[PDB]
Amino acid sequence: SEVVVVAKFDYVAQQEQELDIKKNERLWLLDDSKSWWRVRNSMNKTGFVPSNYVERK
Amino acid sequence: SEVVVVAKFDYVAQQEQELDIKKNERLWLLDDSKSWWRVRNSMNKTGFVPSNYVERK
């Protein structure tokens, strides 16, 4: 992308869709305009949707 | 999960790790303290990391 971020802390991925990162590692942020929530639907699929497209019931 | 969220708008998934949602669809929010960013590392591996574990370089 056009946005580089730096890991503040290590992160151990907990799922296949997550990424292991080390403190001080530089990464591409794929679209700064997009924060995601991990959600599960009524057909038992888990994935990501933009946080601003959903709201807490 | 037990935290219910409701789609404010339709969202057509752009990637297989995202979900298609329709306005008014109800989902469960998993990791409800967690917002995610999609990042790509120096080995061109892509995945989600918690948005609070990275900052703008």
Burial (CB count within 10 angstroms: exposed 0-12, middle 13-18, buried 19+), residue A8: middle
Tell me whether residues B5 and A45 touch, CB distance under 8 A. Answer: no
Distance from CA of residue A11 to its chain's centroid?
A: 12
Three-class SS state of A53: helix
Q: Note every long-range contact of A20-28, with CB atoms under 8 Å and residues 24 or more positions apart, other chains counting.
A: A21/B39, A21/B41, A21/B49, A21/B53, A21/B54, A25/B41, A25/B42, A26/B42, A26/B57, A27/B39, A27/B40, A27/B41, A27/B42, A27/B49, A27/B54, A28/A1, A28/A3, A28/A4, A28/B39, A28/B40, A28/B41
**Alpha-carbon span A40 to B38, nearest angstrom:** 18
Among candidate residues A40, A42, A2, A49, the one with its CA nearest the CA of residue B48:
A49
Residue B56, chain A, CB below 8 Å: the answer is yes
Number of A/B CB contacts below 8 angstroms equals 152
Backbone torsions φ then ψ of B48, nearest 5 degrees: -90, 145
Cβ under 8 Å to A: B residues 20-39:
21, 25-31, 34-39
Within 10 A of A14 (CB to CB), how many other CB atoms are there? 8
CB B50 within 8 A of CB B34: yes
Burial class (CB in 10 A: 0-12, 13-18, 19+), A40: middle
Residue-number span of the structural domain to which A15 is assigned: 1-57
The conformation of residue B21, written as its DSSP 8-state character, comes to: B
Total of domains in chain A: 1
